[model samples]
Target: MRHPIPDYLASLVTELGAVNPGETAQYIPVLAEADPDRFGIALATPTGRLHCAGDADVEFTIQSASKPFTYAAALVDRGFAAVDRQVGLNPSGEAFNELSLEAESHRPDNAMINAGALAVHQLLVGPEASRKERLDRAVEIMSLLAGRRLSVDWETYESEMAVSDRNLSLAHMLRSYGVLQDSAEEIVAGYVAQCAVLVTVKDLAVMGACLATGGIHPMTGERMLPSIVARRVVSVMTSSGMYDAAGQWLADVGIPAKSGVAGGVLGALPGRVGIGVFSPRLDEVGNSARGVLACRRLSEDFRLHLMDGDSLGGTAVRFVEREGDRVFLHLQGVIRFGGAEAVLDALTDLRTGAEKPGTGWDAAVYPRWQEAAADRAALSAATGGGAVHEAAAAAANDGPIRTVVLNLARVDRIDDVGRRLIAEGVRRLQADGVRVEVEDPERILPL
Candidate 1:
């Protein structure tokens, strides 16, 4: 089947164009001059599939959208301890540009804000790295994640420098607290320039794809950030990326995302897909108005919330085989509660009911199974002691026609609830006189 995603995205661009109420960012002349009517949406999978619509190719200044990527670079270079010392992880509970710092330690509240972003930018190539070295490294790291060579938009950088008094003040405050070791002017200039790096919706989507797949470039197989670093960066984006509107955004959108004043929003759904939306209209909290709407729509339609526990996608049962009365179930993928239930369902009925009439039914086979089950039951019952019998039966019952083996060699991960459920399933099956065996070469099971 041809993918329906492209058509869906094209419809989104057509539908979301009506959500065009907010104004452009007037604080920056370059941002103010942007075409507010321009809107775009793009989604990229970790396997490098991309779907885009509208102005997805139009390039814009990354603006605050660069914070998470820069923060990731700092974490990769400085290690968590050094970066955490310079920048706090908590949300500021104020505007992104407010002088929000810890009272006692004087660290910026988090790397998403202006103060914290500057501190992170300073930590990019170590404290002693020159401006040229730092900026060059910064662009290189971002380009690595983007899977292409990206350059700074000097026009936007110069425009940003003209009205950068507030950023300068934030930089000076960070320097006073010793968060920034080099010249304040030097750090702010570098930070602003980095923020001025140009990106299209497609580029941001690819960058988000790298972040989503734990720093691995979707197409190239390059590791951009360490897995731990990407985790930390996405965690911060979850808590503070939308400035003061973060709490509501988390509840409503339920994606770890960052927004830029230049009308970009990027969300990285861990181990899933990355999303990009651009619209020059600014909402009250500086996020792109239409971009926020598009993200919310996608989150609800796709069920991409971090805390969503409703469904676990596909069934975990890869295949089932029957050799005489002996049955084998091969399970795969990340098994959680929902997947565990599916496995349990297989055990209970073996898909024997008409509702699950798979194929090759024989009424006589069940009687043989019951007869073999009785033989194992009698063997265990004669042993008297439950623990010894359970172990003895498991080892000796391999040749029995009543045996059922849960093959977990193909399985990757089983969550706590899944492990508990599977273990309970084995015990329940054994209690019913069935010789239950587990093939867990990876030691993924609790036993």
Candidate 2:
């Protein structure tokens, strides 16, 4: 069957295609020449599945969008205390190029702005590290997050360097405050070089997916950065990555996102999906006009807003099937209290008798189940391999519900009480002389 998500994305592109009310980054020669009509959108799930539409493979410089990833790299290399000492977390409430710094500490307000971004570049390595070393480290981290090699857009880098005095002033101010320990010019060059890294919308989506999974590359399953570092970088992006328009973006889209002057917007919805959108036409607030709208649409239609608090509700039981006298219970998602309770109720209702659905099973068999519950450890091992096969064969020769299998290979989380409840229910089934087996390949539960 064809997945419907890409269809939705295609429709989204068609819907947003005619929106044409913004300009490219006009000051930079290279960015000013970007194709304003080009647009793309892509999404990457934590499972590494990607859905794309329109010009999703079109390449562009990352620009300021590189801040969060570079910040993550600094956090990974320098640790939080060392990194936090040089950059504040609060939103600057100013433009991206504004010379904002914390009053007393004299550190740049946050890594999302020029001041803090340049400071973060310096923190990628010690002062002894060369300019190329710092730039390499930033690109190295970005490449790992993108799951492929990425390189700087030399043309964009040259254009940015030609207009670098504003950033140079910010770097000099940082140095004067002792927040920067290396040569200001070298650090500024490295920061600008990082911003010029080339990426397609698909690469941005994958990079965001890495952050969404707390620095674990969705496809490769490699740990690119520590979880805490990813969390911290995403937090900063949420607070200030959109510059002065961050508050509005948060209220509208409610996804942690960063924007680039090169017309890319990257968002990471933790544990859900990563989003990337590109359109060279930037709104007055300096974010990609179509990119921001696409994110808002995705968030609204997908229920992706972090503040929604609505569970992506579906029954925990993936499916239930019976073979002869054996019943199979396939479970997925987080096996919490409600999920465990549903499984037990389903077992009792499978073929009801004189008692209320579950009353017969609970009342008649629970006492002995309590006695046998202590063998949970043994049951855990029994599900290992041989016992399940043996139980299935034996049940095939019998009548009624002689065997039940709790398949939890798809489950990723199980609370303590939820596990205990499931253990008790499985024991109760065993007490009724029903052979129960568990399949927990990921070890989501102790049993």
Candidate 3:
């Protein structure tokens, strides 16, 4: 729980919090009321850890941090085919509230902006779902991502709705193109409510972590979004999550991130980490100034840029070591699905050879070399989930392995995809009476 990450973020907040060059958003009176001095940073991991510092618990409306989640919800409500047909993923290269729709398709360039999000907002409801129902479902999906229930900030919602001409105009423009199905008022109202959903920096990080680890709730260990859907959302975030300055943000920070006008910036490195930062000051581009600088520093410190390409998330099984009946598998690379699959191949061979009395691994039990190959091949398949207890009565003496001790001491990382694959494989072997043990999975993975 006490990783160096917390201290690192504490230092960054102190450093950036000093240079108060930006102002709080002035469009809404409530937004401007935020204390410009408040700042926070938090990071969440796939294995359920929250490392944070400063005012991470301070609450604010999610603002544009709500965009990615809404976009993801649309993909979940309606399949990609229908959703993609409605809103394009291409960046608009304009301000977040620009009235631009794609020239030919009449679709918004991407869902990161107001027009696109409104279009996606209409998709949140089913064919018969009503105005209130749509708002409730939108809140529900975000709560799922946040791993807690969320409520709309009535004051914030009422405040934004009063001066929402820019967003209302964008929605009306979308309806004119026939892209948005609902009326401008309807879409804008629901969209406004979503923007008013309150969250802390830690909650934002958990939301980002859900996006990072294929929609798995980092703390709850629940699969909240489809893996493919989470990937698609992150893909859009990489290209269009930032407004106007996304080109610079990606080149410098190199992570799928989003900025909210409420002084929140959150992003996730797929399969690795999720980050959140908050400051009530805005840069020229309408993003959190301190949050942006902190994100760049965090990315640099962790070498997290997708383009960096130095960290290994490859096949993890380095080699196999045998100490008596106990075989030690020395895993050294990234423990991804492919890596887990590679380990599976080896597990099958070892399990098969050891199971049959005169077959594959029986020779290892017999200290003979010739029949080891064929007997290993002829060995019976393991019952992965559960096996009958009859093997115990046959003088089986509690399975062949003292236990397959997988020394994950040197493995770089483990993703949900890999964890499930290896876990399922290990479960089956465990059911077949092989005791599986993991060693030193403290960093980037947990056993």
Candidate 4:
């Protein structure tokens, strides 16, 4: 049977596909020659089930997506402390290809960026080996992530090398700062070869799952990186995931994600799942537009944002009876953004006097502020609470008000403060004879 995940993912791609039409990458000759109509998405779970949609099997160069894996391989080759000495973890905050370095140590900031990626690439094997040997090793590591051998398109590799002036300059600058030990030509060539490694959306999803599974390939069951190094690599990718938009992406979607110029995005939801999205349309920051939208929708629908001190997106109060002393309330969804506010308002409007006969409780609780306030005042007067605050307190005091229901049907990401507040609220409510239940909190929505 076809799973709901596949259908959901396809619907998401179809919806977002319209908003952001595919736009091929123009810098590299081979990439510029790609079909803009080509698009795909795939998701792999740690348990080994795969959900795919669109042209997921179509292959394209891994492009910038290779940076994290290469950096991880380099870290394993070189110790963490040594790698940190060579490339710092702080983001440069400039353009991806901008020539910049740390103020004090002159090291590149994190191996995921261009300068840092070049620094990491310099550590691959040695200059004595032929270019093919160096590339073969890199491909081997990627293959381990994919659970199979992966190949490089030499045509794409050569085309990338032909237009790699900016990367060449960055590598030479890093070498001058003692961050790289080898000749600039060899390191840049290796970096280009790594970028030219071909992969499909399914391959990207599995690779992402490897990172999500703590450097272990979900299918092959091979350890790619030590748990410690994998944690640190994921941390860096989360914080510096989308370059300049990292902060915004985290705030909205709440996952450690990476994007490539080739219109691919990989998100690692720690201990949960790995998500991959592909759409060849570029945003100003070089991220895939459709991919971003799809991720946001999925995060919101699944309540997959990292939990914080205040509220767990998965926690909800369920209500068993609506009109009696035995009412059970259930709550679900991440309690972030205006979601909490909406929930609080809805709960306040469900009391006897707050809701009128046949007037519709949803209409009273969810209408514009002006209409809601008028209804709240009338209900408060009838209930002897004088106002909504007084009515809430009265309801808490009354033994008949059995439970409070929180429907998380609309939440995905909640800020730290929001999380804390929700957790505290749930705790306080539970203490007051109200039980909380969360429904399908881990469910991911379509993009």
Better of 2 and 4 by lDDT: 2
Task: For candidate 2, write residues 1-447 as lDDT tens digits.
Answer: 988999999999999997777899987989998778898999998877999999999999998889899898888788888888898997874444334453676688888888889889999976477888899999998898888899999989888898889888888888888988888888889998998899999999999998887888888878887877888888888888765663476778789988888999998988788888998998888888889888989988987875764332235666677787778877777666766666665555455223434233563557776554346335424432112222323333245787778898877677687799878877777777777888888877785
> Would you list the C-alpha lDDT of every candidate in the order shown?
0.79, 0.79, 0.77, 0.68
Candidate 2 global lDDT: 0.79
lDDT of 3 by residue, 1-447 (tens): 667878888888788777787899999999999788899999999888999999999989998788888888888888888888778988765454434554666688788877788888888866567889888988888888887899899999999999999888888878878887778898899999999999999988999999998888888877899989998888888888874663476788887888888998888888778888898889888888888888888878777886754333223555565555576666666566656666666666564344544334444466655443334323312212111111211222333565777777776567778778777877877787777787765744445
> What is the Å distance of residue 399 in model 1 from its true position?
3.8
Rank candidates by lDDT, best first.
2, 1, 3, 4
Candidate 4: misplaced stretches above 4 Å? 94-102, 126-132, 308-447
**In candidate 1, which residue ranges exceed 4 Å CA deviation?**
93-102, 310-331, 334-447
Question: Where in model 3 is the C-alpha error above 4 Å?
Answer: 95-104, 310-315, 322-337, 340-447
* Superior candidate under TM-score, 2 versus 4: 2
Clashing pairs in 1: none
Range of the 10 consecutive residues with the lowest summed lDDT in candidate 3: 385-394
Task: Count clashes in each candidate, considering only residues at least 3 apart in sequence or on different chains.
Answer: 0, 0, 5, 22
Q: List the residue pairs that clash in candidate 3.
A: 353-361, 359-375, 360-375, 360-376, 384-428
* lDDT assessment of candidate 4: 0.68
| Candidate 1 lowest-lDDT run of ten | 384-393
Q: Of the pair 3 and 4, which is ahead by TM-score?
A: 3
